[PDB]
Symmetry: C2
Subunit: 133 residues, 2 copies
């Protein structure tokens, strides 16, 4: 069939490394791209094609119980070991990540239809906002 319409989820990707190297893509980018999975959306009308591609990586799950300190290896970021403790301050979920970095942690809370997450390390604050789907 010539009908390639649909939403297509990558199951297999062989020698993406060699292909990217042949295209002179830098080592650091190749290290990251080989870990990604793609979803390809094809909208086809006769010989007219529109394709949309998204690349995704799944991070390690983070599971915890409030009030119970746990070991965290921060593989999605700097790959360090921290001892994390999550507590409630009112309706704000507060985490302290004890380790090499000073003032490392995060705070997470709900307002309206949105989730707020503030990440801290040293004097740096990152603010993320998520909408409920």
């Amino acid at each position: 069939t010539r009908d390639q319409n649909g939403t297509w989820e990558m199951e297999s990707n062989e020698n993406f490394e060699g292909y990217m190297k042949a295209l002179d893509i830098d080592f650091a980018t190749r290290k990251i791209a080989v870990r990604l999975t793609q979803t390809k959306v094809i909208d086809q009308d006769g010989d007219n094609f529109k394709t949309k591609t998204t690349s995704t990586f799944r991070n390690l799950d983070v599971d915890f119980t409030v009030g119970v300190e746990f070991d965290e290896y921060t593989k999605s970021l700097d790959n360090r070991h921290v001892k994390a403790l999550v507590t409630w301050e009112g309706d704000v979920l507060v985490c302290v990540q004890k380790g090499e970095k000073e003032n490392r942690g995060w705070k997470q809370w709900i307002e309206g239809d949105k989730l707020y997450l503030e990440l801290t390390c040293g004097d740096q604050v990152c603010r993320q906002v998520f909408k409920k789907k």
Copy 2:
């Protein structure tokens, strides 16, 4: 509310760069990570949390008509200009990407519930397989 259950899609991410730099994450990784959007799935039962996070990047759309040569800037890969021509060979969609690289192109076809995509550059072949969702 302390109930943070749900699927949460990132709408905003401020100073992720400064945070990552504070964590000593390498330049090349930071260049990539600032472009990503996250989906956070929270499964919460009392003070028991399970969180799953996925990071995604959306690539540029690729639109074309079979038989009509078009200009392609390969932003998702090596950022080169090629003149791409897609033709049918039977039910196989064949693209030649004319430019600096020799033997650059791809072939795409359906078999059963799967889409096959073979990418070539020089002597390198990458084979991807997708399942229909």
